[PDB]
Ligand binder design. Sequence first.
Ligand code: GNP
Ligand code: MG
Length: 170
Amino acid sequence: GNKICQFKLVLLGESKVGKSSLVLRFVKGQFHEFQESTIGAAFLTQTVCLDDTTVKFEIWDTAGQERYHSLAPMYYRGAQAAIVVYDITNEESFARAKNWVKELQRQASPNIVIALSGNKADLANKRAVDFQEAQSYADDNSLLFMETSAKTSMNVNEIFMAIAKKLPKN
Ligand SMILES: Nc1nc2c(ncn2[C@@H]2O[C@H](COP(=O)(O)OP(=O)(O)NP(=O)(O)O)[C@@H](O)[C@H]2O)c(=O)[nH]1
Ligand SMILES: [Mg+2]
């Protein structure tokens, strides 16, 4: 196909859940076991093939530490999509993700597509957040949910592609 679309996407979530790892896996096909905490935000782009459309993603990978919370609006303000990420081995991170979801639903664009990533799914032997519970939460709040693993690549390309498919392309 010859159609070309571009969308702004932002990732939000508690520090250490794997936001930078998810983006690097999607964008560069890389995974760094020793990835350092982000300062403020990092920016990356990736283009994918979606049927007859070439979709370019402008991605804002925000720093999750609470001291950067006040900068969040700068990154999600004009976002057409967001991925709120939590760590399936950390219930605290899951609760924090729900609060990010609430903030987006109240302050970001009203038509924003919000996906929920239950990351570090490769660490299921240390699971603290039930898959079905997370699925129910996501269903009740109209969020696109998938458990993912930046480490193995499980559902990484899939969650970004699922978002691309749901964004307006006429
Ligand atoms: N086992 C596993 N480890 C992961 C996964 N994703 C990230 N990690 C690890 O978790 C740690 C934190 O990842 P990182 O991507 O830096 O997290 P972040 O959400 O960007 N942190 P911040 O918000 O502070 O920038 C890293 O050591 C990374 O290797 C995953 O899917 N599985
Ligand atoms: Mg980071």
